Symmetry: C5
Subunit: 205 residues, 5 copies
C-alpha cells in the first residue's frame, strides 16, 4: 500500500546481479546523453572533460507491482536493482557521479536511471577553434553483455540539443547526433551493441 511495502517487495524479487531477460530476449536499454557542460579541452592531447546526463531506461518485470490504491512510481537506490554495466569505451577517467544514485521505478517495471557524470575522453578535438567546430565521438555499450543479453538504442527528446547546456561554458554545442552500431570483435563470437554520440562543439568568440 505504502512506499516501504513497494521497496520491501522490490528487494524480495529484485536480483541486482541477475539480468532481467524476458523469455530469451535481450533487455532493451535506451541510452541518451544530454550534455550539461564542456569544462576542459586539450587540442594537443585530444582529451575533453564533459558533464552529461547518461539517461538510461529499461524494463524489469520482477519489479512490477499493482498501482491500484498505491503510488505509481518510487525512487530506489541502484544497489537494490539490476543496472546495465554500461561503460564509455573511449573514457580515460573513472565516471565521477555528481547526483544521488537513485533510479525511478514505475509500477509496470520501467526503470529510469539518469546519473549526471563528469568524465574525461580520448576523442578528435581538432577544429574546436573553427567555424565548423570539432566532433568528439563517445561510444557507450555493455562491458560483459553481447547483443542477445543487452541491446542499446538511442532515444531523443524533440527539444533543442543545448536546452540544458551551461551558458557559462567556454564552448557552444552545434549539433548532437546519436548512432547505434552492432559490431563483432575478435574476443567473442556474439555481436556487442553501442550508442555512438557525436558532439559537434566549438569555442565562443
Amino acid at each position: 500500500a505504502d512506499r516501504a511495502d513497494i521497496l520491501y517487495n522490490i528487494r524480495q524479487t529484485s536480483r541486482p546481479d541477475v539480468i532481467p531477460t524476458q523469455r530469451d530476449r535481450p533487455v532493451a536499454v535506451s541510452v541518451s546523453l544530454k550534455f550539461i557542460n564542456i569544462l576542459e579541452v586539450n587540442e594537443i592531447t585530444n582529451e575533453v572533460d564533459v558533464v552529461f546526463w547518461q539517461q538510461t531506461t529499461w524494463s524489469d518485470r520482477t519489479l512490477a507491482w499493482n498501482s491500484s490504491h498505491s503510488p505509481d512510481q518510487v525512487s530506489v537506490p541502484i544497489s537494490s536493482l539490476w543496472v546495465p554495466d554500461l561503460a564509455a569505451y573511449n573514457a580515460i577517467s573513472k565516471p565521477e557521479v555528481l547526483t544521488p544514485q537513485l533510479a525511478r521505478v514505475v509500477s509496470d517495471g520501467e526503470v529510469l536511471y539518469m546519473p549526471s557524470i563528469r568524465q574525461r575522453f580520448s576523442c578528435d578535438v581538432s577544429g574546436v577553434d573553427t567555424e565548423s567546430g570539432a566532433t568528439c565521438r563517445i561510444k557507450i555499450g555493455s562491458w560483459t553483455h553481447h547483443s542477445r543479453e543487452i541491446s542499446v538504442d538511442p532515444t531523443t527528446e524533440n527539444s533543442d540539443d543545448s536546452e540544458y547546456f551551461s551558458q557559462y561554458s567556454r564552448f557552444e554545442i552545434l549539433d548532437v547526433t546519436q548512432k547505434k552500431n552492432s559490431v563483432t570483435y575478435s574476443c567473442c563470437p556474439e555481436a556487442y551493441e553501442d550508442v555512438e554520440v557525436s558532439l559537434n562543439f566549438r569555442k565562443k568568440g
Copy 2:
C-alpha cells in the same frame, strides 16, 4: 527512556531508502546555503570553488517520540535516516563533505542536517574584479522527487549573509538572495521545485 532507547527506536522506525510522506503529502524540505569561504575563481572558465553549509531541514514524524522524561534531541548518523536526494544542478565536482555526517533529530520528528561542503560550480564570474562584483547562481532541488513528493523552500529570516564568511578569503560577499522556482520540464508531467541561491561577491579592492 534515555539516548540509547531513542537511537534504538529510530533504527526500528527509520527507513533510509523510503521517503516519509504520510497520506501522500509532500515532504517540506527547508534548503538554504550559508557561505563560509570562496577559495578559487576563474574569470575565463567561469568556475568558483566555495565552502558553504548546505542547511537542510525537514520532518520525518515516524521518528517522533515523547520527551517528557527523556532528552528532547539526539545526534544521529545520516545512514540511519532518510535524507532528501538534493543535487546542485550546476556543480561540476562531487560534494567534499568536511564535517561529521550526523543530523540533529528533535522529539517532534524535525531533522536538522547541516553539512559543510567544498564544491566547484559552473556560474557567471563576469565582473568579479569590479566594485559591482559577479552574481554566481546555484540551483538545488531533488534529483528524483517531483513537487508532490519533495517541496523545497528557502529559510529567509533577517541575518548577515557574511555572518560566518571567512575574513581571510581574497573575496567578500555583497548580497545572497534565495528564491523558490517551480518548473515543469518535458521529461515528466509533474513540476520539480528548486531553490536558486544568487551569490553577489567580488575580489577585495
Copy 3:
C-alpha cells in the same frame, strides 16, 4: 580474564552512535593539538597545510572493566567506540588521517584517541616572512553537540610547543596558545564550545 574477553565485553556495552553522558552532565573532552609539521603556506590565499596530533581524551564508563587479574589497557579500533564529532571549523580539506585508527582504552573507561592528521586551513598567514611571524587560529569543536552534551577544554601541561615539530620544515613555531570559548549562535538557544589553537610561526631566517 584476557585481552580477547575485554574486547568482547567492550563490543557488548559500547554504543558507537550513543554519546556516553553520566547523569544529565556533558562528556568532558580534552582536545590539544601537537604540531609535527607545516608543509605548504600561501600568504596570498591565506591557506596553510599542517600535520598535528589531535590529542583527544574522554571517559566512557560503558567500556570500564575489572582489571585485578586482567590487563589495565587495550588498543581498540575507534569503529567499536563512541568518538566525539569534532570538526576544525576553518578547515578547507577533509582531515587526512596518517595513523592506524586505534584508541587506547584504560579499565576505568578513559579513552585516548590521538590521530596524526594532515589538513589545510583558511587562517591569517600575513607576517609569515617577518620576525614576529604569522598567527594562524584553528577552532575545533563538536558539529552537533551543544555544551550540555560535549564540553571541550585544552590539555595544557606547559610542554615545549616544538617538542615533536620537524627540524626539516621550512618553518619554525614561535608559540602555541590553546583557549576555550563558549558561544551562543543565531541557529540555536544552547551554547556550543570550541578550543581555539593560535599557531604563531615563521619562515626560518638565512
Copy 4:
C-alpha cells in the same frame, strides 16, 4: 535453471579467499595487456600514464554447472569470485579501474576478468621522441602465490599490437611482445612467475 539459480549457486559455492587449486596443480592464469591509450610520458622522471585492459583468464571448476538447457555464460561481480592477486611490479600508482567490476563465468568454470585500468609505471621512456621509440617494460605476477600455486603465461593470441589503441593519442605503438619469466628471489626458495610486456612506442611526427 534460470540465471538467478546459476548466479545464486556460483556465489554460494565460490570461496573468494581460497585459491581454487585442483589435485595440487597450480591455478593456470593467462595474462594479456591490450593498450588503449598513453596519456602522459616524462623522459626526465621515466614515468608513463597508461590506459590498458588487463585480460585475466583462469578455471574454477567448482563453479561448473550443467548448461545443456541453461545459459552457458553469466556476468558475475568479481567480489563474489576468487581473483588472482596480480600486481604490476613496477607500477607507482594503485590501478584505477574504469570499467564495471564484472567477470564473465562460462559453464565449464572458466573466468574472464578484463578490467580497463589507468595506472602509472616506472620504466625506460628514453628514445620516445626518436624514430626507434622508447621500450617501456611492465612486469605482472602474483604477490603471494609461487609457481606451484599460480602460474602466469601470456595468452597465445599474438593479435595486432595497436589493435584497439586510440588513433587520437599523441603516441603510436610500434611493437608489443609478451614473454614469461620464472625467477627465484632471496626471500623464498620457491620460484615466482611473471609476464613481462615490452611496449615499444613513440610520439607521432
Copy 5:
C-alpha cells in the same frame, strides 16, 4: 586439511582487534624497508616521494597447524588477521598500498605481511645532488602498543641495498642502515620501540 580448513581455523582463532601476546611478553615484530623507487625529491621543502616494501613478520602460535599431509603455507586476507598497528612517524601522506592486501601464514604460525607502499616523508634532503648524497631517516613503530606489547627489530640481513631498486629512478642508493630504538616519551610511563631506516641516496650523473 585443504587451504579452506586452514583459513577457517585461522578465522575461529585469529582476532583482528586482539594482539596475540603470550603471558606478559610482547609480540616480537620484525620490520625492514626494501626501497623500490625514489620518485620526487625537493631539497627546498625537505620532502621525498618513495616506493618501498614494509616487510613485517611476527609469530602467532595459536594459528599453527599440522602440515605433514597438508599445505605448509596459505595466503590470507589481512582482515582475517591481527596485524601490527605500525606508523611511519615522519610520513606526511597516507600510505598508498600498491599491492593485494594478503599475508602469507606458515604452518608454524609465522605471518609475513609485505605491502609495497608509495608514501611522502619529511626528512633531510640536503646534499642530494652531491657525491655524499642526502641521508633521509624514516622511523617505523606501533601507534598504540608500548614495548611490553610490541617490540620492533630490523630483519637480520639487508641482502643488498639496491637489490630491487628501479634502475630508471633519477636517484641511486649509496647505503641503507636499519637500527632499533627504545624511547620513553612525556605522554606515557612505558618505553615505545621504533626501527630507524637511514636512506643514503643521491641524483645519478
